[PDB]
Design a protein around this nucleic acid. Structure first.
Length: 74
DNA sequence: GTCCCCCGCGTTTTAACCGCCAAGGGGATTACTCCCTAGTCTCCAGGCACGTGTCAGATATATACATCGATTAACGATGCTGGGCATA
């Protein structure tokens, strides 16, 4: 659950992970999120978001999604 | 010396907090002009100090009137008392 991520950010951060799944990943809408840089610490190799979030409402999220999957790329 | 209103403690119930994102009111900046102020001059009449003045109150004050308080001179009636007059 999304609660539990943040309540125990630390223990998962240490153990290695290389594959990520998330449900209804329109959460990462703003680039100022708490789970937005919470997820970045979890040593990871590949990610996988899966939601139908429309990506023209704001250009922020369109960019946020691109920045989050690939840190660096417009 | 008595009684019952707080503390400690287990469990049940609400809402504080954190995270996230949105949206617009209102505060912050800037530019221009124009009213309102300090600064400066002259003047006096406003203001300060004081002598002069008749009117509120307050205090007797000479003069007069009314009412007794008390005293003294005067008047009505004696009471033994003293100084003499008719009878045992």
């Amino acid at each position: 659950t999304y609660e539990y991520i943040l309540k125990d950010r630390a223990e998962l951060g240490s153990i290695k992970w290389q594959f990520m799944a998330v449900d209804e990943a329109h959460r990462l809408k703003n680039a100022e999120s708490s789970l937005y840089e919470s997820l970045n610490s979890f040593k990871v190799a590949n990610r996988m978001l899966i939601t139908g979030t429309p990506l023209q409402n704001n250009i922020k999220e369109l960019a946020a999604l691109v920045n989050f999957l690939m840190p660096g790329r417009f």
